Design a protein around this ligand. Structure first.
Ligand SMILES: CCCCCCCCCCCCCCCCCC(=O)OC[C@H](COP(=O)([O-])OCC(O)COP(=O)([O-])OC[C@@H](COC(=O)CCCCCCCCCCCCCCCCC)OC(=O)CCCCCCCCCCCCCCCCC)OC(=O)CCCCCCCCCCCCCCCCC
Ligand SMILES: CCCCCCCCCCCCCCCCCC(=O)OC[C@H](COP(=O)([O-])OCC(O)COP(=O)([O-])OC[C@@H](COC(=O)CCCCCCCCCCCCCCCCC)OC(=O)CCCCCCCCCCCCCCCCC)OC(=O)CCCCCCCCCCCCCCCCC
Ligand SMILES: COC1=C(OC)C(=O)C(C/C=C(\C)CC/C=C(\C)CC/C=C(\C)CC/C=C(\C)CC/C=C(\C)CC/C=C(\C)CC/C=C(\C)CC/C=C(\C)CC/C=C(\C)CCC=C(C)C)=C(C)C1=O
Ligand SMILES: CCCCCCCCCCCCCCCCCC(=O)OC[C@H](COP(=O)(O)OCCN)OC(=O)CCCCCCCCCCCCCCCCC
Ligand SMILES: CCCCCCCCCCCCCCCCCC(=O)OC[C@H](COP(=O)(O)O)OC(=O)CCCCCCCCCCCCCCCCC
Ligand code: HEC
Ligand code: HEM
Ligand code: HEM
Ligand code: HEM
Ligand SMILES: COc1c(O)c(C)c(C/C=C(\C)CC/C=C(\C)CC/C=C(/C)CC/C=C(\C)CC/C=C(\C)CCC=C(C)C)c(O)c1OC
Ligand SMILES: COc1c(O)c(C)c(C/C=C(\C)CC/C=C(\C)CC/C=C(/C)CC/C=C(\C)CC/C=C(\C)CCC=C(C)C)c(O)c1OC
Lengths: 66, 48, 76, 238, 98, 373, 35, 164, 184, 54
């Protein structure tokens, strides 16, 4: 069985708006990788990415849901 | 209709009787009609 | 009470019975023009202030977020 | 600084839109099989269900399915009996501390009014239960914690309780994690407001009655105020 | 300054109800003494203008533009009578301090 | 008949101005709201228990087991909100149309406003939620400002070291007893007014045009009552939790504190001012003045015209005052951080400077423009 | 002016007496020991 | 006149004396009930808290913060400038044991609970108006007027602390 | 002042008969007793709890732990007794001296008497003793006498099958609210 | 009153309940603070939860 969310997520996820968002997060993820010896984290980047993703998913999860 | 004024509106007493009687039945009609609507609006979701 | 309220003279006052006159004479006929007449007479003295309010509101919200935003140079 | 759960198109989101009672029944099953181990629906008693999603005798069945102690006995304290329709839902961890211990310091918050007590609850609930994503770089949650972008601080002691196919819906509707989170959010919502449906019916009758009564009272006022509104004044100095 | 005073007179809006400037004064003790000292015709015109303005405010209407009160035309009738009331009032006051 | 004499004098044959707008409805609405609150409050009092172990349980029992008890409770809460809406619009009508020159009526009014704010504060403490307990502590510790008299006084109200059952029970008793004092003060408010009669939006002597009240301003008050009932019910039956706060649905935990704490909407303007002043005492005083500045208002009238219908510059200043009152209501909500603070500080400075300084100077300028000064 | 000055000078002594009563009253009632 | 008025003056004092007494007893009623006063009791277990942690037992209806501090924790608080402190009270001044700090959780400002292990001074933070308290519980930033209070506890043992 | 007029119309310049005896004091005493009851009642309401588990405990807590709480409670009880003493002597004065020819005053009086009796009955139910509970059941049962709607009315007031917490709490609300109606 | 409190303590306490009277009430009536403290600490409470809600 496939949770409908996964589908909806995939869709919104594939979107570039989101893709680049994720990429920005990636740069952030990497920054922390090299800049490993610091206190800077990627939480903020994480949230903004998700807000976008979820907003869209949320726009379209209930339809699939039964 | 001039029968109304003469039969219902003219004497305060009559003016009243019609109000009370109408109200007595209005509730029946209103509740019934209203319920029909409410239910249909959410026909699917209700115990039965 | 009535009778001792004020002293007027020679002011005739005509009127009509409620049931004899239309209930809503030209209600939308002149009502709209009048309502519009009215608004243009106070709009310049009511809205301007609140417009700036919307503005401060917006600027305020955005500014706050920016403050929360991580400083790029921070930690780097 | 907290993620703000999005708006979901709930079946009760509309102005006159009631709750889907099959979803409340499924969410009660979700609470009974998963959420009741740590959380306590203190203010919801079996009797409450009757009329919403379970019939009188049917509820009795559920009631008969729990052991509830009767403290005062001729010489004893507890022969937990078949819970009745008047019994309230059984709270796990009779004492708060007990759970504190069990949940590693956390105290599952009684989910009777959780939806009402949490800002944007229905959404929050859904989000939290479904927001168990990967912790990011730099984060160092303390022992016995998990990562949810929504929970305040993003450090909820509650471990993720809904794994796809965690429980089987008696109705057979596929028990996907989401289908389960949506059902339990509807149920918790119902819990926090058992009268949601009844009210909306009162609101519909109120809108119909005000739509009847406002123009009629306006017409009576404009009758009794026409006299003056037509008054013509004339000044006739001698 | 004269044109800007006419613009402010139009912006005040009591001319659209047919009122004078002295009709719009708040009736304090000195203003009521000045109103009591008015001649009968001026008092009757003032009361009719106030009643017509109240009726127009009741119906949320204004006068037609040809019937408004022209700034130039407005007459400060109560003013002369008022100054005296104030003058007399002040005189009595200073004398009190004596 | 003695009674009918009185009845005919205040509601039937009372000479009222013919041209008063819908704003003059609002005070009558307030009276209706008062009765509504009292009636709903009485039907909350037959099941509420003022014990810290059982107060939240009694409120949930009202909402869940009493027949239509949720209806009466949310009618009480949203009727308190409707009371403050009608109160703010009543005070705004009094400020705009120069009705503060009825000085005794205005002072009995500001006494009524203080009593209503105290009643609503203790009533919000009464359900003993998380938000009620932290709100009480906070608002009460505010009293701890006074150096010599304050501290003890606080625990005196708290009836102990910290708010606890001792408070809840005495807050239930006060909150019960003060709306009847409000009703008596409203009777005094009506008396001090009939001696002078109501004002009209033109601000002129309306003695030449007065009409009865029974057929003209009664059906108008009935229509206003119907519209106010439409808004209340549609704020109870459809949007019941719109004006409330979600954290009040949790039980009162002294060990935890709601992360985001805020007074209800109506008490915010004051909240902003309090937060704005750096000094604690300063805040308390300014806060008080915020309400009291109104009482001070009849001594600041420097114009020869009573109303603002013919006064455009003071109209602009009035709407700027309403604007930054809305701004202070918003700021209170916002948390403590830039730049919400600065706005709060300015907004408070602008509020006090417009009421104290700008309006009498503007009235002098307006009198100079009409060749009166 | 001069007259009101005479009035004040004539009543202030009386007023002080009244305040004195209040001092005793307030203190006695407050039971403020500092006094 | 002096005979008749002396009676009026006599009576007044009497009434005045009764009136103060009646009014006094009511004010006393609203005052602490005997039971409420009987709360001076309290107990704690040192072992309960390890360094860098705070614990409260709701003593007297208020959060009784009890905390253990680290070498560094104890080291910084001493480093704090007492004079430069909003409230001059050196860390040790409020603690019998550097490893052990005990505070009452009522924000000097408006009485909320400071949240331990949060803030810009590694001690406390009050989510109500942003007061940051150092580990010593001294108000360092914000609008809180004075440092958190240190109850007169009692270190009977390194394992038991009566707060007294 | 407009308000001052009311005072000088009802208490200062009111023309009163010169020869009225001490019996005419009693009604004023009743008003004082009413205030006294209200004041003492308010200071009972800051500690009383209208819960059947805690009502007797709250009354004992008032008598034993609140500072001078026994004084306010026994002042309230004996002030109710003093209220009824002054009420009976007021009614006896009205009967003896022919004051019932003031018919509207007499009818407002007998309405006040009914309200005071109902207030005292529910107040005596309020401490939730043995005697209060059996007394309440008894008089509530009195209503059942009604020919047709009696049973319903009794159950309504009780708020249940038999007097229980449902009653106590609504009796606390009604006992609180009726002395202000008595004042009006 | 002190002698009668002893009687209860020894003979009638085992079966009757003086619930509304607490060790605090005695101070200043029959016993001092330390005597009533010793009297209270002779008796033992058995309830109130613990870390385990025990
Ligand atoms: C524009 C469309 C309507 C239109 O063209 O009609 C012209 C008409 C204006 O005609 P006019 O000759 O310029 O003015 C005379 C009045 O209309 C004379 O009648 P009125 O309108 O004063 O009627 C009495 C008044 C009485 O108003 C009240 O009693 C208000 C009471 C207080 C507000 C409710 C309490 C709660 C407030 C919470 C905030 O009722 C209202 O004002 C209702 C206002 C509704 C506004 C429109 C939205 C619906 O507009 C209306 O009548 C508005 C009301 C009906 C819609
Ligand atoms: C249990 C009942 C509790 C009643 C509590 C409230 C009682 C209020 C009495 C007020 C009152 O007596 O003052 C007026 C009354 C006016 O003084 P008066 O002009 O000398 O009156 C002489 C007769 O009492 C003038 O007598 P009368 O012809 O005016 O009426 C007889 C008088 C009661 O006097 C009697 O001769 C019958 C006593 C039985 O009326 C009552 O007080 C009925 C009391 C029923 C008990 O004052 C007194 O009667 C008591 C004087 C105490 C002086 C203390 C000196 C040290
Ligand atoms: C920041 O938010 C705010 C609050 O908190 C949400 C408030 O309560 C208030 C108003 C209240 C206070 C400042 C303190 C009030 C305290 C109580 C109501 C509890 C104690 C009550 C009493 C001692 C009796 C009730 C109070 C009365 C009767 C006030 C009496 C004054 C007049 C009658 C005049 C304000 C202005 C406020 O700004
Ligand atoms: C709200 C806007 C209402 C509106 O329509 O604005 C224009 C109107 C003009 O009114 P006016 O100049 O008197 O002309 C009447 C002509 N028939 O303006 C008016 O109707 C006058 C409104 C006066 C009262 C406004 C109250 C606004 C709310 C104030 C709340 C805060 C008050 C202070 C509280 C402390
Ligand atoms: C004049 C205004 C009178 C009150 C408002 C009248 C219009 C609305 C009347 C009720 C409409 C309705 O929804 O009926 C069914 C509905 C009950 O639903 P049902 O039992 O399923 O019919 O009636 C109600 O709306 C109950 C709440 C009515 C409250 C009216 C507002 C004023 C309360 C004052 C309290 C004191
Ligand atoms: C074995 C433990 C455990 C299980 C299983 C569990 N929970 Fe929880 N839950 C917790 C704990 C512990 C908290 C409080 C932790 C915290 O707030 O940090 C919590 C809190 C919550 C909250 C409120 C969080 C907040 O912000 O206050 C919701 C809603 C919730 N749980 C829903 C659920 C649902 C729905 C399920 C299952 C269908 C579930 N829980 C199963 C342990 C559990
Ligand atoms: C308890 C809440 C209040 C109620 C129920 C109330 C009610 C009323 C009513 C019914 C009137 C008669 C005017 C009319 O209805 O047309 C009135 C007038 C007035 N009220 Fe209020 N009021 C309240 C609070 C206040 C407050 C707080 C103030 C002061 C800020 C105030 C100031 C006035 C003034 C000045 C008038 C005379 C205005 C006029 O009638 O022209 N009132 N009030
Ligand atoms: C005699 C008149 C009044 C009585 C008897 C009364 C009674 C009560 C009672 C028992 C409660 C607690 C129950 C509950 O909160 O659900 C309550 C709550 C409340 N009352 Fe009142 N009240 C009265 C008047 C007022 C007035 C005039 C106001 C407005 C100033 C008011 C505002 C409130 C508020 C805001 C609450 C809390 C609502 C909430 O829980 O969210 N009440 N009242
Ligand atoms: C609004 C004013 C009043 C309030 C707030 C009030 C409040 C109370 C309260 C809380 C109690 C329970 C505590 C107790 O047992 O005394 C009580 C009892 C009582 N009240 Fe009232 N009361 C009021 C007015 C009255 C009046 C006017 C009467 C006389 C008609 C009265 C007669 C009683 C009686 C007889 C008791 C029972 C006394 C007893 O315990 O033996 N009360 N009242
Ligand atoms: C025209 O001027 C007036 C006016 O003179 C009066 C007396 C009233 C008072 C009439 C009302 C219906 C309001 C009632 C006032 C109260 C204070 C209600 C009090 C409620 C109690 C329970 C007491 C007005 O509402 C009004 O304007 C419409
Ligand atoms: C000559 O006739 C009168 C008389 O006209 C009046 C006003 C009073 C004065 C009445 C009182 C002082 C009693 C007032 C009654 C109350 C109920 C006071 C209000 C109490 C509340 C709790 C409100 C008399 O005592 C009197 O007889 C000598």
């Amino acid at each position: 069985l496939v949770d409908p969310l996964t589908t909806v997520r995939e869709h919104c996820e594939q979107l570039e708006k989101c893709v680049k968002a994720r990429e920005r997060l990636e740069l952030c993820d990497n920054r922390v990788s090299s800049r490993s010896q610091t206190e800077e984290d990627c939480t903020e980047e994480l949230f903004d990415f998700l807000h976008a993703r979820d907003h869209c998913v949320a726009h379209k999860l209930f339809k699939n849901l039964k | 209709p001039s029968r109304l004024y003469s039969l219902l509106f003219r004497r305060t007493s009559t003016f009243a009787l019609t109000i009370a009687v109408g109200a007595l039945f209005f509730e029946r009609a209103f509740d019934q009609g209203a319920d029909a609507i409410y239910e249909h609006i959410n026909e699917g979701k209700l115990w039965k | 009470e009535f009778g001792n309220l004020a002293r007027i003279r020679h002011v005739i006052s005509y009127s009509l019975s409620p049931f004899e006159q239309r209930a809503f004479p030209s209600y939308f006929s002149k009502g709209i023009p009048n309502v519009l007449r009215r608004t243009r007479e106070r709009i310049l003295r009511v809205a301007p202030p609140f417009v700036v309010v919307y503005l401060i509101y917006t600027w305020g919200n955005q500014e706050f977020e920016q403050s929360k935003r991580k400083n790029p140079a921070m930690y780097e | 600084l907290e993620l703000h759960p999005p708006s979901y198109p709930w079946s009760h989101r509309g102005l006159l839109s009631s709750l889907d009672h099959t979803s409340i029944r499924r969410g009660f099953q979700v609470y009974k099989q998963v959420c009741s181990s740590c959380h306590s629906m203190d203010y919801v008693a079996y009797r409450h269900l009757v009329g919403v999603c379970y019939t009188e005798e049917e509820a009795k069945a559920l009631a008969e399915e729990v052991e509830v102690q009767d403290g005062p006995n001729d010489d004893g304290e507890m022969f937990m009996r078949p819970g009745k329709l008047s019994d309230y839902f059984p709270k796990p961890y009779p004492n708060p501390e007990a759970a504190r211990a069990a949940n590693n310091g956390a105290l599952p918050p009684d989910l009777s009014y959780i939806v009402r007590a949490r800002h944007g609850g229905e959404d929050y609930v859904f989000s939290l239960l479904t927001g168990y994503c990967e912790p990011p770089t730099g984060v160092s949650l303390r022992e016995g914690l998990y990562f949810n972008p929504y929970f305040p601080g993003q450090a909820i002691g509650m471990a993720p309780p809904i794994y796809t196919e965690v429980l089987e819906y008696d109705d057979g509707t596929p028990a996907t994690m989401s289908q389960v989170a949506k059902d339990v959010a509807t149920f918790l919502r119902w819990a926090s407001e058992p009268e949601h449906d009844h009210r909306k019916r009162m609101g519909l009758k109120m809108l119909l009655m005000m739509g009847l009564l406002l123009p009629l009272t306006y017409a009576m006022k404009r009758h009794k105020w026409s006299v003056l509104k037509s008054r013509k004044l004339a000044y006739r100095p001698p | 300054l004269d044109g800007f005073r006419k613009w402010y007179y139009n912006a005040a809006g009591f001319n659209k109800l047919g009122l004078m400037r002295d009709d719009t004064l708040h009736e304090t003790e000195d203003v009521k003494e000045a109103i009591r000292r008015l001649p009968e015709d001026l008092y009757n015109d003032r009361m009719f203008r106030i009643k017509r303005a109240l009726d127009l405010t009741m119906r949320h209407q204004i006068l037609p533009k040809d019937q408004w009160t022209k700034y130039e035309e407005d007459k400060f009738y109560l003013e002369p009578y008022l100054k005296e009331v104030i003058r007399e009032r002040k005189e009595r006051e200073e004398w009190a301090k004596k | 008949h003695p009674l009918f004499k009185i009845i005919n004098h205040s509601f039937i044959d009372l000479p009222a101005p013919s041209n008063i707008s819908s704003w003059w409805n609002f005070g009558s609405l307030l009276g209706v709201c008062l009765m509504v609150q009292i009636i709903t409050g009485l039907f909350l009092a037959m099941h509420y228990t003022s014990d810290t172990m059982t107060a939240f349980s009694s409120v949930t029992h009202i909402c869940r087991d009493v027949n239509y008890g949720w209806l009466i409770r949310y009618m009480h809460a949203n009727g308190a909100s409707m009371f403050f809406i009608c109160l703010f619009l009543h005070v705004g009508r009094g400020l705009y149309y120069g009705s503060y020159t009825f000085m005794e009526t205005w002072n009995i009014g500001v006494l009524l406003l203080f009593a209503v704010m105290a009643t609503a504060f203790m009533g919000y403490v009464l359900p003993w939620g998380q938000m009620s307990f932290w709100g009480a502590t906070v608002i009460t510790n505010l009293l701890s400002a006074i150096p010599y008299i304050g501290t003890t006084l606080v625990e005196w109200i708290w009836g102990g070291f910290s708010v606890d059952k001792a408070t809840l029970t005495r807050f239930f008793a006060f909150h019960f007893i003060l709306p009847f004092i409000i009703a008596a003060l409203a009777i005094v408010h009506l008396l001090f007014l009939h001696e002078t009669g109501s004002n009209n939006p033109t601000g002129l002597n309306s003695d030449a045009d007065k009409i009865p009240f029974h057929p003209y301003y009664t059906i108008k008050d009935i229509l206003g009552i119907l519209i106010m009932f439409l808004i209340l019910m549609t704020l109870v039956l459809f949007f019941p939790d719109m004006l409330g706060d979600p954290d009040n649905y949790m039980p009162a935990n002294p060990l935890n504190t709601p992360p985001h704490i805020k007074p209800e909407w109506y008490f915010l303007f004051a909240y902003a001012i309090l937060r704005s002043i750096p000094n604690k005492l300063g805040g308390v005083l300014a806060l008080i003045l915020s309400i009291l500045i109104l009482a001070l208002m009849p001594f600041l009238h420097t114009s020869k015209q009573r109303s603002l219908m013919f006064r455009p510059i003071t109209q602009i200043l009035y709407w700027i005052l309403v604007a930054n009152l809305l701004i202070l209501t918003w700021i209170g909500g916002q948390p403590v951080e830039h730049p919400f603070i600065i706005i709060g500080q300015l907004a408070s400075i602008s509020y006090f400077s417009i009421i104290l300084i700008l309006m009498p100077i503007s009235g002098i300028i307006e009198d100079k423009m009409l060749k009166l000064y | 002016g001069p007259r009101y000055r005479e009035l004040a000078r004539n009543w202030i002594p009386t007023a002080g007496m009244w305040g004195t009563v209040g001092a005793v009253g307030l203190v006695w009632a407050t039971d403020w020991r500092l006094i | 006149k002096g005979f008749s008025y002396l009676v009026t003056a006599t009576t007044t004092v009497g009434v005045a004396y009764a009136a103060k007494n009646v009014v006094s007893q009511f004010v006393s009623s609203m005052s602490a009930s005997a039971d409420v006063l009987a709360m001076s009791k309290i107990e704690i277990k040192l072992s309960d808290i390890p360094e860098g942690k705070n614990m409260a037992f709701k003593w007297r209806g208020k959060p009784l913060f009890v905390r253990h501090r680290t070498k560094k924790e104890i080291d910084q608080e001493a480093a704090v400038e007492v004079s430069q402190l909003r409230d001059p009270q050196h860390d040790l001044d409020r603690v019998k044991k550097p490893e052990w700090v005990i505070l009452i959780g009522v924000c000097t400002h408006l009485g909320c609970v400071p949240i331990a292990n949060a803030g810009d001074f590694g001690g406390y933070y009050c989510p109500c108006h942003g007061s940051h308290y150092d580990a010593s519980g001294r108000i360092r930033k914000g609008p809180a007027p004075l440092n958190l209070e240190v109850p007169a506890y009692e270190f009977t043992s390194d394992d038991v602390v009566v707060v007294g």
